[PDB]
Ligand binder design. Structure first.
Ligand SMILES: C[N+](C)(C)CCCCCCCCCC[n+]1c(-c2ccccc2)c2cc(N)ccc2c2ccc(N)cc21
Ligand SMILES: C[N+](C)(C)CCCCCCCCCC[n+]1c(-c2ccccc2)c2cc(N)ccc2c2ccc(N)cc21
Ligand SMILES: *[C@@H]1O[C@H](CO[C@@H]2O[C@@H](C)[C@@H](O)[C@@H](O)[C@@H]2O)[C@@H](O)[C@H](O)[C@H]1NC(C)=O
Ligand SMILES: *[C@@H]1O[C@H](CO)[C@@H](O)[C@H](O)[C@H]1NC(C)=O
Ligand SMILES: *[C@@H]1O[C@H](CO)[C@@H](O)[C@H](O)[C@H]1NC(C)=O
Ligand SMILES: [Cl-]
Ligand SMILES: [Cl-]
Lengths: 534, 536
């Protein structure tokens, strides 16, 4: 045995495993259950806390991945496989993971809680890019990551019903957060300093915890990477959720809510996943079938209303985007795009792409988008049109929604820091035209380049160390700047006045002003006004 | 005759004329001023098409400028050179259809290309006798034969009751056309080549030139054209027959008048000054860069809207030179946008900006106005007074001149014409308007005409060299349809404007510089998006 790998939490004893990190050992407690398996009659229902266990629970291996659709667009392709489940799929998946320095910290250490992305229909805390050993070893951080239900299992809703209230996947995350308040101290973590961070749907999830009162007492700071609670894809109305739920029911042979849900519960998991994608209202990209719902409960109102009228006085937030938020999504549905060629498109393909990229847009609105992104000096140039289609998708779904959030949070009392990540991993396997795709800053924040066997450049390894510092400094103090180091340059807070943000790349920090200011004014101020009349 | 300068006696279709020998910096020039080309359009001729001037007896004296067409006189800034320089400099009268001719002295031995100037003034003012349109420099230095004509403005030249016989509209344009025919028939007597006539004009004059390009009967009277800061298409150069009818009958009511015959007959009994006194009271909304009586789409002179005509016209054998000045809109702001004055910096608030936009784009809906505001707002400093002031200027300039010009250059180029484009960026050292206005509408004219060559005018030496360059460009273009000088490979060339490369040059003290895209993004907003917003 080894007293450093043995811990006692409210539900019982656990035994972790000593793991090897480039510069030393780390303690890892993997696959800890935080809820009763949400199986059988518990499908679609809120999670219940895990009942106490006897003996020493083995926490040396990752638990199962929540049941979800598996990507098959590019079989054998590293670029896609790296996001696919790396453990058995099962509805019994509510487990979390903890990494801590070895030996366990002498004094309470700030805690970082990761919430993965995957459009609310996929993902898992066991993926290699979320490996928390690096942050634990190098920065002495206590890192936690939980699995939460996705797809229909976590978000199918029949608003108002008792058996399928919606947002249970968000409640899974919340329960994991409560578990941290109650047990993290046993691992040397400071429950009084918990920072949530996540990417994409994970970022939107973090945003939702910021906007839901019951979550606010479970964390202190937040980081949203390439994702927000507001925006066109992160939420749906109660009406739209009901529509999709009943439509999915129909597609699988079911059928009063109770009856419908009861029948949905008798169906095999893969049956539900098989039809998940057939409930989307129009042909589109960056749209997901089962996502959080404005239930008037977890979310008292739309994220839009909540961020416009919220008081964020004592909150510190770090937000940012990658250089090419939209490239990735284009190959999943826009005619003319592929990872295998340059994807130089025609102007016609561009107008077609926009209708798919902004599925909710009227013809006039679509026209405005086209006229705004067309480069009138080279209106027919294939390369510009291709890069413009990427920008439309990235701006509409991430950048502008992020600019919007940064602005409201800053205007309403929060301390905000913003960035744009611009370094493309030397090991990226997607084509060059995609630039720095959605999700590729993660491996750097988690510190993977510090693993010699991964073949990153020496520069990349120094870069990752910088980023890890920023994130952990932010977790420690609510300020990413190094408290002691007297000449940086400094990363200034983001404000509505100066709108300052920094570029994260191999070069030293560079301060810039206005995050796609003109273009986001188009998306955030004009387009809305357009559709509410037309 | 007997003792007179034999070089100043000339005969034209209507009779004998005696000109005057004038002095130009580098030598003498011949000037024939105040030649009548039409019967005085007075009394029962008011509002009617011009009739050719009947022959006269004896030697008509053509040594001084004739009357200025009856028009509104600006008094916004009494005593101010900036405004006075455009005011009438001869007696006002409805008897005003006269033209002027400048030629080298002695008159050219072989046929010389002819340049015909058509003045601007929003179709409500102007005169060919203003100092900035003095043709002596172009005649003396480039050996050009320059002609300029007065044409009726305001109600006298554009009030129309479409379909009627007594006030068909566009008579001011017909006055111009009659002067062009007069040139075809008589310019040879002065040594001008009737087979090489280039029309050039600025603002309403440029719009006029554009309308001659779009009206078949005028096409046989000229060969090349220059449009400076103006176009026949755009929001101010024309009105629909319905709108002209409305304005004319409203003006009729305002002066006590009331069937078209009755109305027009009553209008003809009214004193000229009474018509001018109510001219401005017929505009549909509060606005700037909008004029009461302008060319009407009558389905005659203009068979269709200038927009339709430039989109479907064949401009195969046409060479055109077009351009704008650096700050087309500044000037207009002081005539109606609250917060703007020539006497202070005109730093404005964001609220004043939104209000200025409603006045500057008077025909825009609330949604359209918001679109303009959102497009011109600098979101990094949305409240900065200086940027707002400069943005208000840009809105007015782009909507009324720059984008309409870009639209025109594009259609002409795509449809067979040879087009050359420029942006004039030099501010006269002698300008009396405040610095914030930059290079205002109309201030490139004194340079094209060569005034800086006159020592007494106090222009800098560089300005004088600049003027000489411009005169060369314009006359080269008039001679060959190409502004470039064949005997000179050093000076960078001025490339034609094409839909593909969209090249145009900057005209300033520096040597020519080629640029691409004339306000391409912003004009796409005005020319492609705003309209579509309108179709809903
Ligand atoms: C009116 N009505 C609803 C009847 C028809 C209207 C068409 C709207 C649906 C389009 C959804 C966007 C394409 C996504 N899309 C589809 C799909 C869904 C419906 C139609 C065509 C394709 C897909 C389908 C299956 N079975 C399995 C995997 C995938 C898939 C996987 C990943 C991903 N990112 C997108 C995907
Ligand atoms: C529907 N209803 C008729 C009841 C109201 C609509 C009237 C709005 C018209 C505003 C015209 C823009 C200001 C021009 N504007 C006006 C004027 C016209 C109407 C109302 C207020 C001012 C002016 C007035 C007089 N008497 C004499 C000279 C000038 C003037 C002179 C030069 C210039 N460039 C512009 C000028
Ligand atoms: C600039 O001027 C605008 C127009 O006001 C006129 O000019 C000023 C200088 C005074 O002489 C006044 O009597 C005139 O009516 C003003 O509306 C504007 O506020 C002025 N700008 C500022 C803020 O100084
Ligand atoms: C790229 O491949 C896609 C599908 O494989 C195809 O539709 C498109 O035309 C190709 N583009 C190029 C660069 O040829
Ligand atoms: C030109 O300058 C002279 C010398 O100062 C002055 O007497 C004259 O009035 C000026 N004339 C002009 C055009 O301003
Ligand atoms: Cl005016
Ligand atoms: Cl006025």
């Amino acid at each position: 045995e080894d007293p450093q790998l043995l811990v006692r939490v409210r539900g019982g004893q656990l035994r972790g495993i000593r793991l090897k990190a480039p510069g030393g050992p780390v303690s890892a407690f993997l696959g800890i259950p935080f809820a009763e398996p949400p199986v059988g009659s518990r499908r679609f229902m809120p999670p219940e806390p895990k009942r106490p266990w006897s003996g020493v629970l083995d926490a040396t291996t990752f638990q199962n991945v929540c049941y979800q659709y598996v990507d098959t667009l590019y079989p054998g392709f590293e670029g896609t496989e790296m996001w696919n489940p790396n453990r058995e799929l099962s509805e019994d998946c509510l487990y979390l993971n903890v990494w801590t320095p070895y030996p366990r910290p002498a004094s309470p250490t700030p805690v970082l809680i990761w919430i993965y992305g995957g459009g609310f229909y996929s993902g898992a805390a066991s993926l290699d890019v979320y490996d928390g050993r690096f942050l634990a070893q190098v920065e002495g951080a206590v890192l936690v990551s939980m699995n939460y239900r996705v797809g229909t299992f976590g978000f199918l809703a029949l608003p108002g019903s008792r058996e399928a209230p919606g947002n249970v996947g968000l409640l899974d995350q919340r329960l994991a957060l409560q578990w941290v308040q109650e047990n993290i101290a046993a691992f040397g973590g400071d429950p009084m300093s918990v920072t949530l961070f996540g990417e994409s749907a994970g970022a939107a999830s973090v945003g939702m915890h910021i906007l839901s009162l019951p979550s606010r007492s479970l964390f202190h700071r937040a980081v949203l990477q390439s994702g927000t609670p507001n925006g066109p894809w992160a939420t749906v109305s109660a009406g739209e959720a009901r529509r999709r739920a009943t439509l999915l029911a129909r597609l699988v042979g079911c059928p009063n809510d109770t009856e419908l849900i009861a029948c949905l519960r008798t169906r095999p998991a893969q049956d539900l996943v098989d039809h998940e994608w057939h409930v989307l209202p129009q042909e589109s990209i960056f749209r997901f079938s089962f996502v959080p719902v404005v239930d008037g409960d977890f979310l008292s109102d739309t994220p839009e209303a909540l961020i416009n009228t919220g008081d964020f006085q004592d909150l510190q937030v770090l937000v940012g985007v990658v250089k090419d938020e939209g490239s990735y999504f284009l190959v999943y549905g826009v005619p003319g795009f592929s990872k295998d060629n340059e994807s130089l498109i025609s102007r016609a393909q561009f107008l077609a792409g926009v209708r798919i990229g902004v599925p909710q847009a009227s013809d006039l609105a679509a026209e405005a988008v086209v006229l705004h992104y067309t480069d009138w000096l080279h209106p027919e140039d294939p390369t510009h049109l291709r890069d413009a289609m990427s920008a439309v998708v990235g701006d509409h779904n991430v950048v502008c929604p992020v600019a919007q959030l940064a602005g409201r949070l800053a205007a309403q009392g929060a301390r905000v820091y913003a960035y744009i990540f611009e370094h493309r991993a030397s090991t990226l396997t997607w084509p060059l035209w995609m630039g720095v795709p959605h999700g590729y800053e993660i491996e750097f924040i988690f510190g993977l380049p510090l693993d010699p066997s991964l073949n990153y450049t020496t520069e990349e390894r120094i870069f990752a160390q910088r980023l890890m510092k920023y994130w952990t400094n932010f977790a420690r103090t609510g300020d990413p700047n190094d408290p002691r180091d007297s000449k940086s340059p400094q990363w200034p807070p983001y404000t509505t006045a100066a709108q300052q943000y920094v570029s994260l790349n191999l070069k030293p920090l560079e301060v810039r002003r206005g995050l796609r200011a003109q273009t986001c004014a188009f998306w955030n101020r004009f387009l809305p006004k357009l559709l509410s009349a037309t």
